[PDB]
Amino acid sequence: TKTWRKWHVKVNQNEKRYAIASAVAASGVPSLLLARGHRIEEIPEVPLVVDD
């Protein structure tokens, strides 16, 4: 085993931002939250905002 393997992988910055926007949007679908495994059957509403 050598140390000059390919440890880090380049990703287009745009599809990085596409991924975040997609994952943020998925954070606002209550059904996707349940499959992810979050016990939020009593959460008041989604997205759950709180006071400043």
């Binding site: 059904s31 996707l32 499959a35 992810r36 495994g37």
Partner: peptide, 18 residues
């Protein structure tokens, strides 16, 4: 977004109920 796009995420392979 709606029932079918959610289906292809929660339903098809990965859930917390499968």
């Amino acid at each position: 977004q709606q029932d079918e796009v959610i289906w292809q995420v929660v339903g098809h392979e990965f859930c917390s109920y499968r």
